[PDB]
């Protein structure tokens, strides 16, 4: 019952149980019908929290693995755990990504929905990239670039420069440039122009998303200052 599955999802969220939360919204999406946008947001929160817990564990242990340059035994132990954490992290990304390919992107009927799910697809391939090594990696990076790019094209054409979603896409796509493709200048100019373009049209801000747009603009500018360091 999509409305039960959704009500439990918010219960899961208040209890800080994001894997339960993510399981509810997963099965909602699987009912094959277009997600509402309170629904869409519930799915995005769940999986961002579920995947983010693994990303953060990965980074801690990956770091231990590098600070233990043999120390072979400690380094072997760290490697093994890293790879165990990776495989949780890949299952999570593949889960999301198959939801995107199978239901959410095909059912997206409005432009804002397509930019949102294509960004999300850019995001989950980027999390796979953070963690890919070798043969896998170029393919994975290409897919992330391609989703962001498509999203970026639609959002430039359809949305106001201060729209939270267009701003967030520019934020994440610029992060992809800097962090995954090691191209800081491209990252800086993508973020600079998204910032400047939103300053040029502050009249387009609305009461109900004012807050998010404003926060993302600040995050754009903070990365820039970090990247120019």
């Amino acid at each position: 019952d999509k409305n039960e599955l959704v009500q439990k999802a918010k219960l899961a969220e208040q209890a800080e149980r994001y894997d339960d939360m993510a399981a509810c919204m997963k099965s909602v999406t699987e009912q094959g019908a277009e997600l509402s946008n309170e629904e869409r947001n519930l799915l995005s929160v769940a999986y961002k929290n579920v995947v983010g817990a693994r990303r953060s564990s990965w980074r801690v242990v990956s770091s231990i693995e590098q600070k233990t340059e043999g120390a072979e035994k400690k380094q072997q132990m760290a490697r093994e755990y890293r790879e165990k954490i990776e495989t949780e992290l890949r299952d999570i990304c593949n889960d999301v990504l198959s939801l995107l390919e199978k239901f959410l992107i095909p059912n997206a009927s409005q432009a804002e929905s397509k930019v949102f799910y294509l960004k999300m697809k850019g995001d989950y391939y980027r999390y796979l990239a953070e963690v890919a090594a070798g043969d896998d990696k170029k393919g994975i990076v290409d897919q992330s670039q391609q989703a962001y790019q498509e999203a970026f094209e639609i959002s430039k054409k359809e949305m106001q420069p201060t729209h939270p979603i267009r701003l967030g896409l520019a934020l994440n796509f610029s992060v992809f440039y800097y962090e995954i493709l090691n191209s800081p200048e491209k990252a800086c100019s993508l973020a600079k122009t998204a910032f400047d373009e939103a300053i040029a049209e502050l009249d387009t801000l609305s009461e109900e998303s004012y807050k998010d747009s404003t926060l993302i603009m600040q995050l754009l500018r903070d990365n820039l200052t970090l990247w120019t360091s």
């Binding site: 947001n41 995005s44 929160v45 961002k48 929290n49 995001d123 939270p164 967030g168 934020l171 994440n172 992060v175 800097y178 962090e179 998010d212 926060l215 993302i216 995050l219 903070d222 990365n223 970090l226 990247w227």
Partner: peptide, 9 residues
């Protein structure tokens, strides 16, 4: 570490 888009939310 660069900052990406947070939850609204």
């Amino acid at each position: 570490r660069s900052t990406s888009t947070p939850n609204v939310h």
